[PDB]
Amino acid sequence: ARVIRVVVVSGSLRAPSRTHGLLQALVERLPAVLPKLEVHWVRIAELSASLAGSLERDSASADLQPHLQAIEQADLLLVGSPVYRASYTGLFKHLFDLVDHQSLKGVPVVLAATGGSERHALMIDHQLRPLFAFFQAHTLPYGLYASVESFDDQRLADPAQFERIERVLDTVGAFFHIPVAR
Ligand code: NA
């Protein structure tokens, strides 16, 4: 079996964050569907310095290069952003403005977001999904959207979200043709 390279992009501007907690909950259950995997994180909240210094892919700062390569070489991408101005954060977007635009074609992508309100639940399908559709990535059908009520501080605490995570993982296992049994 091939080790599946999983890269997790957390778009929060600050740490700790509910978006991070949502991504952790997903990541924690990932080994139940993938027999071999390496999981790596790209956390915007720690990259503001490297991000500012990077205006083109080929000229990106040496310290951002590892994060870009990881995304560009991932077998599976999990992405999450809190909702800002009814979309993902601009710094999360700046990251993807640098990511090679041929590199994600056909790559499975899980979309996730956290918001202050349910009113922006459509950000998943009208903002995050189109972003990854530009890359022609294989966005997976079930996106995660959790508003503030789903969390205890920054930890996911909502049984309905834990269940939807399991449905996401069903689709991850199916995509990698992992013989369906857990
Ligand atoms: Na790739």
CSV table of N, CA and C and ligand atoms in Angstrom, one decimal, residues 71-75 102-105 107, ligand 1:
chain,number,residue,atom,x,y,z
A,71,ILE,N,1.2,21.2,-0.5
A,71,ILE,CA,-0.1,21.4,-1.1
A,71,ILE,C,-0.1,20.8,-2.6
A,72,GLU,N,1.0,21.2,-3.3
A,72,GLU,CA,1.1,20.8,-4.7
A,72,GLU,C,1.4,19.3,-4.9
A,73,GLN,N,1.9,18.7,-3.8
A,73,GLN,CA,2.1,17.3,-4.0
A,73,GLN,C,1.1,16.4,-3.2
A,74,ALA,N,0.2,17.0,-2.5
A,74,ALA,CA,-0.8,16.2,-1.7
A,74,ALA,C,-1.6,15.2,-2.5
A,75,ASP,N,-1.8,14.0,-1.9
A,75,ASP,CA,-2.8,13.1,-2.5
A,75,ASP,C,-4.2,13.4,-2.0
A,102,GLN,N,-1.8,24.1,-11.9
A,102,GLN,CA,-2.0,22.8,-12.5
A,102,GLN,C,-1.9,21.7,-11.5
A,103,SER,N,-1.5,22.0,-10.3
A,103,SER,CA,-1.1,21.0,-9.4
A,103,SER,C,-2.2,20.2,-8.7
A,104,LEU,N,-3.4,20.7,-8.7
A,104,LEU,CA,-4.5,20.1,-7.9
A,104,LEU,C,-5.6,19.5,-8.7
A,105,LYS,N,-5.4,19.4,-10.0
A,105,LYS,CA,-6.4,18.8,-10.9
A,105,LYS,C,-6.7,17.4,-10.5
A,107,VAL,N,-7.5,16.2,-7.7
A,107,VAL,CA,-7.1,15.8,-6.3
A,107,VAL,C,-8.3,15.9,-5.4
B,1,NA,NA,-0.8,17.6,-6.9
